[PDB]
Design a protein around this ligand. Structure first.
Ligand SMILES: [Cl-]
Ligand SMILES: [Cl-]
Length: 162
């Protein structure tokens, strides 16, 4: 298991524009296109992202390419963020994956806001952080995915994904 496989399980793969759990236009492997309520606006963001007139449909290769870019950006965002970096540096490889997953789903800003949980992870208080992470809109809105990520931070293994 690795970050790519992990996220492919959590996000799935769709080659036509779809709406995510929050109702936002998305495509591929969880690639958010726009928060705007307009399909046209989504189609336009899509074309600009792919570099061709797509008509809301992409190939598997194109989906994976957006995916590689998105994981790279998530890592880079973590490394550039003053609150996230130190946490990431302190963690083992498996738990780092869980932090990347959260950033991919919610953005750097979103994750950076889990101040208390972050401090707990940095201190390696696994059970405490898992409880704190669960007291969030994130857990309440997407509980199964949240539980998978939390179990990962709690155990340091891939058990939730196997
Ligand atoms: Cl893009
Ligand atoms: Cl979920």
């Amino acid at each position: 298991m690795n970050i790519f496989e992990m996220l492919r399980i959590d996000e799935g793969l769709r080659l036509k524009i779809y709406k995510d759990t929050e109702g936002y236009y998305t495509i591929g492997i969880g690639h958010l296109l726009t928060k705007s309520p307009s399909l046209n606006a989504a189609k336009s963001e899509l074309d600009k992202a792919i570099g061709r007139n797509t008509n809301g449909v992409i190939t598997k290769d194109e989906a994976e390419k957006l995916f590689n870019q998105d994981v790279d950006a998530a890592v880079r965002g973590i490394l550039r963020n003053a609150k996230l970096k130190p946490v990431y540096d302190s963690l083992d490889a498996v738990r780092r994956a869980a932090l990347i997953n959260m950033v991919f789903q919610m953005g750097e800003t979103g994750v950076a806001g889990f101040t208390n949980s972050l401090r707990m992870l940095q201190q390696k208080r696994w059970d405490e952080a898992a409880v704190n992470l669960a007291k969030s809109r994130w857990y309440n809105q997407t509980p199964n995915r949240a539980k998978r990520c939390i179990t990962t931070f709690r155990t340091g293994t891939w058990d939730a994904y196997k």
